[PDB]
Every structure is written in structure tokens, then in C-alpha cells.
Ligand binder design. Structure first.
Ligand SMILES: [Mn+2]
Ligand SMILES: [Mn+2]
Lengths: 429, 583, 300
């Protein structure tokens, strides 16, 4: 807490001492004041700081050479000290134990001042007079890592400002792109394997989506492995609904860049298929449909058999939302074209599941959709539908013999025909 | 073949679409392996386990456990090294739980290994795992450095130390966190001369690291190094590190330091503790963060207790008490809550004169505090202070507060004071309880919270077991018999509860003479709940009562109750009759 | 009262008191017996005078135990649970199983009323189905409870004067006879009298207003007073709407709302309230506070 000195208007003074008044102002606003213990105290000091900040954000892009070599460190320093102050603990959120929407986000106690500072820093980077080569000497990896660490705050607004300034830094500074990507790999690995709690995942996924949209070059191995071991493992987290759209956008972007990466993504999604959670099953079906829309017929054929097997499994679910979303796949004309192409393999899998749940569900809409799908199958092909029907009735009687033979034989060979009459002495308990 | 048939059934299970069957097969693999025998088990384990790796991580977890306990299947140390290759691939996998299950199994089986096999096979395996190009392998290898160290040779020991240093110097933070966590164990295994030579440089780099998590892990691990190092060396070895950790800008590091403050004080040494930890504790107690203040308040007692009694009290009165006083009126719930529970145990530590002079006014403030959490803690721990201060002085100081808190709105507060009442009843005497503490017990009994009523009944039993049966007969029985007239059936149940509870100590004679007719009269109540509870009390007092009264008065009434329309009442009357075997 | 069945129920209740879930076969048997017992009830159930009316628990087990301490135990005090307790709350399965096992024992002492969350679609959309599937690995328990919910009674009458109903009045229903002739054993309609019955709330605007949610229809003070005068009801109690105090006088003492779920959504900080009815049929309130609270999805 320091008493500010009497200062004049920047536009009134000649441009000769405009930068001297500017760096003195950058030093005056460098001082911080309490906002959580006694916000009543130092009101004069607070309003003076706010008036100074308001003049600065205006001064930017409203004068010649507002930002120059001697100004670059002072601007970075004032932004750094205020922003890099240690974040308080999530006392009331209890570490965001409650849902992020249900939990009240901790809005910055000094948001107005912070908002102004974030606005000023963005105006600084965007300004034409800003030079990345001059600033690269001063903005270093420590600045980037501190900014990335700051992404854990609650206020959505400051998170948006962080995302915007990170995008600006990534675009302007070419030399730090690899380091930024590496640090984003780490902030994602740590969240997925160690913490399992975070608030800035959506913004980081948005930043990644712009980087993928800017992957004009053919994907390098680093990008491929990063997609296969960062984005796909992110579906394991229980908070998928928070950042689902961003992850969906990112997955589609990577497949648009390279369709050869389609088969593995599909296997990873099927492996990470949720069994207990329904909302997660819903978003998984949404992701599948979005991907299914852009798949080249060739890549689709490679994984049609397990994808539709999982689809037939999910239809059987008594959940009405899961059932309706799976049955809505018949609306997309492309999926209809894909099945008309591959009916000979596709029908024998979907058909028994659809028949089994034909009358089991309680909801009327589910039954209506199932009958619609049933009529569509016999309409597209009558002979194939009849063949699937006779195979289904044959299986309905053969399942008894199968269950009788498979269960008895497995148990017998498992231990009855081995543990008991082989190496009895070595066998224990 | 004999080896082929179990391998085939497992393949069939792996190819099965149902994952549940595969999980049941891998969970029941132990017996299948018992059948194979030493000759076929090992030939099956290498190729099959590599195949099993390509399955659900849940399946991988199942074999992880199985392998961790399959020392019997391998002939012994001679064939244990065959289990290393599968475990290695199970440890280097992506998923965390299976990796943890694997490394811990590896640590468990590392002991059974022979030193020659350790150097021949285990050391190359750990070298490869530490040299892996992925962070999971490095994190797994972090956990095997300690176990294999004591039996390898000096050159192998130096190589392991160099690999551990390289792992600590890793650029990836996840690897650094695993190394920082295992630093304490590695130092414990390491020799003191080698610790001073290598552990201190690796530790300082981590303490001075920019990342906060590796910093807090380092300050947590510093306890083991402080234990091993001589006290004379700790002044110039870890004291700069402790000062930097205490003065660190990250509040998480300060919180971790505060949480383990007692351990650091114990390890460093009491004399060095007062000289270098008292200003630090005072600064940590007066910190701008709530969590560090809360952690500090928790250790306030332990730190005072472990002080050298030579000047302990002087230290407290001169440095601690001013901080506590400042902290008492702190504008935060958590710090006041933690301090209130911890502060009571400071009474005996402070000289007896100091308590009355300083602790009692702080206690009265914590008692009068609006915060519900602080007062409840004080009353729960109020038991200890009775010994330090003479009862006559103690009662005068706290009874004003006790009689105000007895009618506190929160039931939990009232529940605690009821539990503590027996102690004051015994200490003060029967005359004191009758003169001022009896009305409190009555109002407690007639309270509308059922938990309060049960606590009051238990309290009644606790005071009557020591105050004499005749005293309650001539003083409590007439008072409690009046409550039966209350219009609410719920308050009538309270009368029944206390009649049931005090019958045991009053004995058959008194029960028949005064309260048995009251229960008999109450039995004719219209509410079915009253009839249901009368039957319960009659069953309980039936053994206490004489057989002649049972047959003469209890039997006919129970017979009438069995004829009652309410299935609930009839059933319980029948149960009471069967229990007493009157019919 | 089979001796084996009574001791089995006592054990099941005791196990539940330690926050331990029952086995699937035992749960199904208990649900079957509860359904058999409840099939003999009517749309309205006669209730004795001394009863402790309780608001919607919301399946939060810990606060439910606190309630059982503040009031008497179920065998000791008659309980009227008339609210949602099958979703939007952790350990919901434990809460609903304890309530049902308490209903089958001492059926006369305790009575439970169907709420708006008992609907199959509503139970599933609000986080019950997934949790039950997590705690049991199958949907059989979920289907058994949805059937039990379909067989729950809708509303009950206390001593012929106090009319206790979850939700609010419906334009179609004009007397208790309309509720009686109606069929309680059905899945809740998307739009219909039962839909308005379990979703309506009082409002100050007056007249048959519309609730912000499509399912309910807000009722004015005049309609409530007219229904009370026609049906001879001194007071109507409801639990659907959330109240911070846990109790309020909605229409000048014509209607009262009781909420027995404290610290709702772990952010409201509300204090729960319980209604007390003595032999004189007078009403009292007592307040309490929440008790100190004490694998990947793909993985099997
Ligand atoms: Mn409701
Ligand atoms: Mn509700």
C-alpha cells in the first residue's frame, strides 16, 4: 500500500515526456492492494488506480509508438505481478466437489481492476507497434508456464481472457509454439492421471482446436501420438460433459486432417465406452455420429463390425435417452447410405437386438422408432430381412444348446479336467 | 498338449465377446496355473501374459494381483526372474492403477530374489525402465530404487544413484513428483555418507524448483533427511531449505510445512527447534492465508508439548500466548474451530497460575462466541480442565457460561453438555446439583428433541448410579411421575423411558411400590404408541419384578392387551408374554 | 407376522442403519412384499391424528438419519413421509430401501406418498438409474422400484381434517371423490390430472396460473380457499416446492409447505423443518441442521 503521487493527463503533456509519465504510471499501478480483507480501505487509492488503468487502455492504439523497447518490460512486469499472485484455495467450493455449474464460481474479488488489466494486455499484444522479436527477449518460458498455471481459476470471464491472450501469444510468438504444446501435454497428463480436477480444460481444448485448424502441414508424429495419448484418454474423466463440445470439435478436426487415424480413434472410443454413466453414453453416441458423418467409406468398413456391435448393445439399454439417440442414427442419410452398402454384414448384428427390444421398452417413442427402423430394414431389402429373420429364429433355439455346451465345457476344462487330475500335489486349496 | 489345453481355454475366454467371462477366467487363473505345474506354468506364462496385455485394463488389474502372489508357482528364487518380464510390461502401461498394482507387486517380490539374480536380471530391468522414453515407465522405475539397493554391489550402487539423479533431473514434472515422493525412502535406504554426498544436491534442486507440487513434496520428504543427518549438520544442511520453504510465496508449500511442523521439530532437535523454528512458527501462525493458520492452530499443542520443559512455559507465555490471543478473534470459522479443540490441552502445560490468568478469559470468549462450531468443541474437551484448576475456582469461572449454554438452540451443543453433566454432578456433590442443576435436568427431559431426551435419560442413570438410590426415590421419582400427565403422547414416552431406565437401580421393591401403578394406569391410554411402549417396558421390568406380581397383575393385563384390535400391540403383548413365559 | 420374516426385516433395517445397502435378491423380495401390502390400499388412505408430517427427503441418507434422531424413532412416532426421496441425492437407494423396509414393518404407524420424481423418465434423467446401475450392476432393482413407485398412493387424509398432498391442486379435480374414482396404479401421465396433482404450486398471482415448468399449473389463493371450504379441510400440506426456512404459510394459513431436505444442492444452505401433530391435531415446527458428513466408468 503506497500513496500515489499527483499525475497529469498523458495526452495533455508533450510526447517528449509521455513515455516517462507512462513508465512511472506502470510503476504506480505495479503496487497491489487488498480486496478480500478490507476493500473499504484505500478507496481513494483504488479509484486512482482505476482511473489510471482506464486512461492506459484508451491511450493504446490512440497514439504513435505507445509501446516501445523501454515500455515492453514495464507493461509485461505490471501484468505479471498482478496476475501471477498465488491463487487462493477453493474454500467454499470445497475443491469444486460440487458440479461446476451447481458450484458458485469464485468471481475475482477485484475483477473490475483485473478485467481492465487483461483488456490492456490484449491491446498491448494486438497493437501494430508490438514486435514479437523485441518481446521474445523478455517474454520467456517462465512467463508462458505461469500464464498456463493461472488457467485454474474459477471466474469464466478471466478464463476467457486467458484463452484470448494465450491465442495471441501463440500466433505472435513462433518460437514458443513447441514449448506451449509441450506444457499443454503436461497440464493434460497431470489432470488425467493425478488430479482429476480442473476448470480450464474447455479453454485449453478451444486453444488446441485453433492450433489443429492451423495444422496446414501434414500431421507430424508428435501431433499423431499427442492425439492418440492425450485427447482420446481425456474421455475417461467423469467431467467430460464440461468440455465435451471442444473435445468433439478437436477429434473431427484431426480426422479431417488425416482419415488414416480413424480406425484407432474408433477403437479408443469403444474401449473407453462408459457402462455405469448414461450422460457419458449420450455424448459418446453424439461423438460417434459426428465422426460417422465424415468417414470415408473405406475407413468405415474397417470398423463397421465392432462399432455396430456396440450400437446394438446400447439400443438394449432400458434408458430412453440412450435408446432414442441410438435410433436417431437412421435420420442421417449418410448412415443410411453406409448400411445400404454393407447390409450383408450389418443386418445380422443389428437385427436380433432390434427384435429383442421391439416390445420390451416402456416409452412409446422408443417403440415407434424401433418399428420405423424395422420397416426400413425390410423395405431396403426383403430377402435379406427374411434371411436375418430365419437366422434369428434358428438362434433363438440354438442359444440353449450353446449356453449348455459353452458353460459346462469351460468350467470342466478350467479346473475339473485340469486342477483336480493334473499336478494334484502342487494344486493347493 | 498338457500345457496347450489350459492355454487354449484361456484363449477361448480372451476371444469371447462377453468381458465378464474373460474377467472370471483371469480371476480364476490361479487354480488353472496350479494344474499346469512348474514345467508348464513358466512355459505358459511368458507368451500368454504378453497376449493378455492386449485386453481391458480391468483384466490387466486382475492378473496384476494374481502375479503379485504367484511366488509359489515358480520353483523359487531360481525361477522368480521369469515373472519379471511380464510385470515390466504391466508396470510400463498407461493406466495408473494397474501400474501402481504392478510396481507394489515388484517391490513385494524383490525381497524373495537372490542377490545374484538381483544383479543379473533385476538391475537391467530397472535400468531399462528408468531409461524408458515414456513418463509412465520412469514413474514406475521411481519405486524400485530403494528395495534393490541394500544387496547390490558398490558399483551397482553408484550406477543406481546416478540413474536416480538423472530421474530427479528429468524435465517432465510427473517424473519429478514421483522422484520427490520416493526421495525419503531412498535416503532411508542410502548410507549416511552417501546421503550427504548425493541426496542433499538432488533435494535442494527440488526445493528450489519453480513447480509448487514438487516443492511441497520436497518439504514433506525433508523429515526423513533431517532424521538421518546428525543434529550438528542440520544447522548448515537443511536449515536454509526450511527457511526458504517457510518463506515460500506459494501457500500450498507453507501449508505442507505447517502440517508436518511437529515432525520437523522432533527430528531437528528441541534446542535447534526453539532457535530456528519459533520465529518461523510465529510468522506461519500470523500468515495471510486461512489454511496455514488452521494447520498451525492444530499443531499449537504438539509444538508446545515437544518443547524443552526447561523454558517451555516462558516460550509459550512470551511468544505463543500473544499469537493465540490474536488468533482467537480471527474472522474465520475454520481457524477458530481448530484452535478451540486444541487449546484445552494447553491447560496443564501452562503453569497452574497461567491458566486462570490467560486461558479462562480466552475460553469464556470462545464459549460466548456466536459461531456454533467453536463452543461445541470446547464443551467436548471440557473434561480435561477440571483437574488443572480447583473445582471451586473452576465452577465459579465456567458455571455462568454453562448455565447459559444449557439452553443453546443447537441440539448438538445441548447433547454434549448433558454428557458432561455427570462429571460436575460427581465433583460438586448432591447438594449443589439439587440446589441449581436439577431444574436443568428436568427441562432437558421435557425437551422436544428426541436425542436430547435420550441423552437426558442416560444422564439420569449416570447421576443416579453414584448419587444413591434413596436420594432419587425421595427426590426424582415424584418429579418424573408428574410428567406422565403431559398431553403429548411423545412426552409420555419420555416418562416410560425414564421409568424403564431407573427401574434397574431402584430395584423391584421401589418399582412395585410407586411407579408400577403409574405404568399400569398409563397402559389404558387411547394412543396405540403408548400401549406399544407400555408392553415394551412391562417386558423389560418383568425379570426385575417378582413372579407372584407377574402372575397377579402383569399376566391379566398382557392377556387384555393380546385381545387388542391393533395388530402391532397384540403382537408385542404376545412377544412380552412369551419372553416372560407367563403364558 | 412370520417369525422368520420379522427377524429378517429387523436385520435388514439394522443393516440399513449402518449405511449398508441390502442384497439384490433381498431387495426384490422386500419390494414384492411391499407391493403386495400396498395393493390393498386406496387412492386416499385414512391416517390417525398423531402423526409427524415430513417433507421431501431427496434420497440424501445422512440428513434422513438426523431427522429420525430429531423426531422419535419410526416404531415410537407415527411418520407421514410425503415427498420425493428417489433422486437428486447420494445413497438414494439406501434412503428408499430404508423407507420401504420401514413401511412393511408397522404399516399402520408409517405411510408414504408418491411424488413427482417417482416417474420412470424423471428418476432416470436426474441421476438415479446410473447410480443404481453403479451400486448393483443391473437394472432389475431399478425396474422393481419403478413398479413400487407406480403402486404408491397419491394422497392421504389425516383425521378427516388435515389434507396432506405432494404437489398442488389440479383444475380437473373438484372433490376427494374425483381423486377416489381415479386410478392410482399407473405410470405418471405426461399431461393429465395426476401430472398437475404432483407438479402444481401455490402462487400470489391468483387464478389457475401456469408454472414455469410445463407439467404443473399454479393455483391461486381463491381456488385453494374454495376447495378448503367445499371439502371441509382446515389446512393442506405440500412438499414439492423448496423453502429456505423449511416451512412457510403460502395462502394466509390456507396452505403450508414443509421441506425436510437441509443444505439443498449443497449450496442453498436451507434448514429443514418437520411438522408435529399431537392428539389435539394442533401443528408445530422444529428445526435442525445437516449432520457432519463423513474407478473409471469403462472399467468393469
Ligand atoms: Mn416434488
Ligand atoms: Mn422435490
Amino acid at each position: 500500500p503506497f500513496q500515489p503521487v499527483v499525475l497529469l493527463h498523458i495526452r495533455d503533456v508533450p510526447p517528449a515526456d509521455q513515455e516517462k509519465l507512462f513508465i512511472q504510471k506502470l510503476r504506480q499501478c505495479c503496487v497491489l492492494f487488498d480486496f478480500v480483507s478490507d476493500p473499504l480501505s484505500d478507496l481513494k487509492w483504488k479509484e486512482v488506480k482505476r482511473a489510471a488503468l482506464s486512461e492506459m487502455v484508451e491511450y493504446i492504439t490512440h497514439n504513435r509508438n505507445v509501446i516501445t523497447e523501454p515500455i515492453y518490460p514495464e507493461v509485461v512486469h505490471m501484468f505479471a505481478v498482478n496476475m501471477f499472485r498465488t491463487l487462493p484455495p477453493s474454500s467454499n467450493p470445497t475443491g469444486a466437489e460440487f458440479d461446476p455449474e451447481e458450484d458458485e464460481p469464485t468471481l475475482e474479488a477485484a475483477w473490475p481492476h483485473l478485467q481492465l488489466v487483461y483488456e490492456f494486455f490484449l491491446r498491448f499484444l494486438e497493437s501494430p507497434d508490438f514486435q514479437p522479436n523485441i518481446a521474445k527477449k523478455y517474454i520467456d518460458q517462465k512467463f508462458v508456464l505461469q500464464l498456463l498455471e493461472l488457467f485454474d481459476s474459477e471466474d469464466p470471464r478471466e478464463r476467457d481472457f486467458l484463452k484470448t491472450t494465450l491465442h495471441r501469444i501463440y500466433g505472435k510468438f513462433l518460437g514458443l509454439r513447441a514449448y506451449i504444446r509441450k506444457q499443454i501435454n503436461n497440464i493434460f497428463y497431470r489432470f488425467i492421471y493425478e488430479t482429476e480436477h480442473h476448470n480450464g480444460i474447455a479453454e485449453l481444448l478451444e486453444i488446441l482446436g485453433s492450433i489443429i485448424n492451423g495444422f496446414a502441414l501434414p500431421l507430424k508424429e508428435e501431433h499423431k501420438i499427442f492425439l492418440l495419448k492425450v485427447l482420446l484418454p481425456l474421455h475417461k474423466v467423469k467431467s467430460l460433459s464440461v468440455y465435451h463440445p471442444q473435445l468433439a470439435y478437436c477429434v473431427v478436426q484431426f480426422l479431417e486432417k488425416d482419415s488414416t487415424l480413424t480406425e484407432p480413434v474408433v477403437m479408443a472410443l469403444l474401449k473407453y465406452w462408459p457402462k455405469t454413466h448414461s450422460p457419458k453414453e449420450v455424448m459418446f453416441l453424439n461423438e460417434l455420429e459426428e465422426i460417422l458423418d465424415v468417414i470415408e467409406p473405406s475407413e468405415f468398413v474397417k470398423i463397421m463390425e465392432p462399432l455396430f456391435r456396440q450400437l446394438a448393445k446400447c439400443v438394449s439399454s432400458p434408458h430412453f435417452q440412450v435408446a432414442e439417440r441410438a435410433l436417431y442414427y437412421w435420420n442421417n442419410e449418410y448412415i443410411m447410405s453406409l448400411i445400404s452398402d454393407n447390409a450383408a454384414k450389418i443386418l445380422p448384428i443389428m437385427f436380433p437386438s432390434l427384435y429383442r427390444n421391439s416390445k420390451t421398452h416402456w416409452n412409446k417413442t422408443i417403440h415407434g422408432l424401433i418399428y420405423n427402423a424395422l420397416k426400413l430394414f425390410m423395405e431396403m431389402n426383403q430377402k435379406l430381412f427374411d434371411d436375418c429373420t430365419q437366422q434369428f429364429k434358428a438362434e433363438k433355439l440354438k442359444e440353449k444348446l450353446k449356453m449348455k455346451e459353452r458353460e459346462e465345457a469351460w468350467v470342466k476344462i478350467e479346473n475339473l479336467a485340469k486342477a483336480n487330475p493334473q499336478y494334484t500335489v502342487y494344486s493347493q486349496a | 498338449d498338457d500345457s496347450l489345453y489350459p492355454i487354449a481355454v484361456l484363449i477361448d475366454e480372451l476371444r469371447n465377446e462377453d468381458v465378464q467371462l474373460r474377467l472370471n477366467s483371469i480371476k480364476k487363473l490361479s487354480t488353472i496355473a496350479l494344474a499346469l505345474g512348474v514345467e508348464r506354468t513358466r512355459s505358459e506364462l511368458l507368451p500368454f501374459l504378453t497376449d493378455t496385455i492386449y485386453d481391458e485394463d480391468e483384466v490387466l488389474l486382475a492378473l496384476a494381483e494374481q502375479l503379485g502372489t504367484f511366488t509359489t508357482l515358480v520353483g523359487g528364487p531360481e525361477y522368480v526372474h521369469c515373472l519379471l518380464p511380464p510385470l515390466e510390461s504391466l508396470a510400463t502401461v498407461e493406466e495408473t492403477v494397474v501400474r501402481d498394482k504392478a510396481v507394489e507387486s515388484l517391490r513385494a517380490i524383490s525381497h524373495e530374489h537372490s542377490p545374484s539374480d538381483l544383479e543379473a536380471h533385476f538391475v537391467p530391468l530397472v535400468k531399462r525402465l528408468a531409461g524408458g522414453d515414456w513418463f509412465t515407465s520412469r514413474t514406475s522405475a521411481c519405486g524400485l530404487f530403494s528395495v534393490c539397493y541394500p544387496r547390490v554391489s558398490s558399483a551397482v550402487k553408484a550406477e543406481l544413484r546416478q540413474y536416480f539423479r538423472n530421474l530427479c533431473s528429468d524435465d517432465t514434472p510427473m517424473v519429478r513428483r514421483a522422484a520427490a515422493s520416493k526421495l525419503g525412502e531412498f535416503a532411508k535406504v542410502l548410507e549416511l555418507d552417501n546421503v550427504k554426498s548425493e541426496i542433499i544436491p538432488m533435494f535442494s534442486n527440488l526445493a528450489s524448483d519453480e513447480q509448487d507440487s514438487v516443492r511441497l513434496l520436497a518439504v514433506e520428504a525433508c523429515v526423513n533427511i533431517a532424521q538421518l543427518l546428525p543434529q550438528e549438520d542440520l544447522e548448515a544442511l537443511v536449515m536454509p531449505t526450511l527457511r526458504q520453504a517457510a518463506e515460500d510465496k506459494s501457500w500450498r508449500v507453507r501449508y505442507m510445512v505447517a502440517d508436518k511442523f511437529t515432525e520437523l521439530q522432533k527430528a531437528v532437535g528441541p534446542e535447534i527447534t526453539k532457535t530456528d523454528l519459533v520465529p518461523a512458527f510465529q510468522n506461519l501462525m500470523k500468515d495471510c492465508e486461512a489454511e496455514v493458520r488452521a494447520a498451525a492452530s492444530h499443531k499449537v499443542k504438539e509444538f508446545c508439548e515437544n518443547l524443552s520443559a526447561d523454558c517451555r512455559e516462558n516460550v509459550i507465555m512470551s511468544q505463543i500466548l500473544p499469537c493465540i490471543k490474536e488468533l482467537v478473534s480471527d474472522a474465520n470459522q475454520h481457524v477458530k474451530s481448530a484452535l478451540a479443540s486444541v487449546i484445552m490441552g494447553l491447560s496443564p502445560i501452562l503453569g497452574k497460575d497461567n491458566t486462570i490468568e490467560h486461558l479462562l478469559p480466552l475460553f469464556l470468549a470462545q464459549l460466548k462466541d456466536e459461531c456454533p462450531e467453536v463452543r461445541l468443541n470446547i464443551i467436548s474437551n471440557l473434561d480435561c480442565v477440571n483437574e488443572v484448576i480447583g473445582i471451586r475456582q473452576l465452577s465459579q469461572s465456567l458455571l455462568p457460561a454453562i448455565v447459559e449454554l444449557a439452553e443453546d438452540a443447537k441440539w448438538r451443543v445441548r447433547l454434549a453438555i448433558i454428557e458432561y453433566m455427570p462429571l460436575l454432578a460427581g465433583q460438586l456433590g448432591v447438594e449443589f446439583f439439587d440446589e441449581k442443576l436439577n431444574s436443568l435436568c428436568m427441562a432437558w427431559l421435557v425437551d422436544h428433541v428426541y436425542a436430547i431426551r435420550e441423552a437426558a435419560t442416560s444422564n439420569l442413570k449416570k447421576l443416579v448410579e453414584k448419587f444413591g438410590k434413596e436420594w432419587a426415590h425421595a427426590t426424582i421419582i415424584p418429579k418424573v411421575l408428574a410428567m406422565s400427565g403431559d398431553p403429548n403422547y411423545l412426552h409420555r414416552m419420555t416418562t416410560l423411558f425414564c421409568i424403564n431406565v431407573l427401574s434397574e437401580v431402584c430395584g423391584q421393591d421401589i418399582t412395585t411400590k410407586h411407579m408400577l401403578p403409574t405404568v399400569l394406569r398409563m397402559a389404558g391410554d387411547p394412543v396405540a404408541n403408548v400401549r406399544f411402549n407400555v408392553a415394551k417396558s412391562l417386558q423389560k421390568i418383568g425379570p426385575i419384578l417378582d413372579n407372584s406380581t407377574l402372575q397377579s397383575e402383569v399376566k391379566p393385563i398382557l392377556e387384555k392387551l393380546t385381545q387388542d384390535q391393533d395388530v402391532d400391540v397384540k403382537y408385542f403383548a404376545q412377544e412380552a408374554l412369551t419372553v416372560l413365559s407367563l403364558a | 407376522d412370520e417369525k422368520v420374516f420379522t427377524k429378517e426385516l429387523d436385520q435388514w433395517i439394522e443393516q440399513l442403519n449402518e449405511c449398508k445397502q441390502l442384497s439384490e435378491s433381498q431387495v426384490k423380495s422386500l419390494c414384492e412384499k411391499a407391493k403386495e401390502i400396498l395393493t390393498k390400499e386406496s387412492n386416499v388412505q385414512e391416517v390417525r391424528c398423531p402423526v409427524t408430517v415430513c417433507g421431501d427427503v431427496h434420497g440424501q441418507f445422512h440428513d434422513l438419519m438426523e431427522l429420525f434422531r430429531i423426531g422419535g424413532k419410526s416404531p415410537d412416532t407415527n411418520y407421514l413421509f410425503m415427498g420425493d426421496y428417489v433422486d437428486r441425492g447420494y445413497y438414494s437407494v439406501e434412503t428408499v430401501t430404508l423407507l420401504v423396509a420401514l413401511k412393511v414393518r408397522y404399516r399402520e404407524r408409517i405411510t408414504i406418498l408418491r411424488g413427482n420424481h417417482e416417474s420412470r423418465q424423471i428418476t432416470q434423467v436426474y441421476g438415479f438409474y446410473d447410480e443404481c446401475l453403479r451400486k448393483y450392476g443391473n437394472a432389475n432393482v431399478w425396474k422393481y422400484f419403478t413398479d413400487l413407485f407406480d403402486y404408491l398412493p397419491l394422497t392421504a387424509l389425516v383425521d378427516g381434517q388435515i389434507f396432506c398432498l405432494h404437489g398442488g391442486l389440479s383444475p380437473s379435480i373438484d372433490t376427494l371423490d374425483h381423486i377416489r374414482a381415479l386410478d392410482r396404479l399407473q405410470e405418471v401421465p405426461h399431461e393429465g390430472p395426476m401430472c398437475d396433482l404432483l407438479w402444481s404450486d401455490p402462487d400470489d398471482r391468483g387464478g389457475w396460473g401456469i408454472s414455469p415448468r410445463g407439467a404443473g399449473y399454479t393455483f391461486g389463493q381463491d381456488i385453494s380457499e374454495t376447495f378448503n371450504h367445499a371439502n371441509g379441510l382446515t389446512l393442506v400440506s405440500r412438499a414439492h416446492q423448496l423453502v429456505m426456512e423449511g416451512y412457510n404459510w403460502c395462502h394466509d394459513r390456507n396452505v403450508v409447505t414443509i421441506f425436510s431436505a437441509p443444505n439443498y444442492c449443497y449450496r442453498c444452505g436451507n434448514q429443514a423443518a418437520i411438522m408435529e401433530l399431537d392428539d389435539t391435531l394442533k401443528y408445530s415446527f422444529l428445526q435442525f441442521d445437516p449432520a457432519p458428513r463423513r474407478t473409471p466408468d469403462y472399467f468393469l
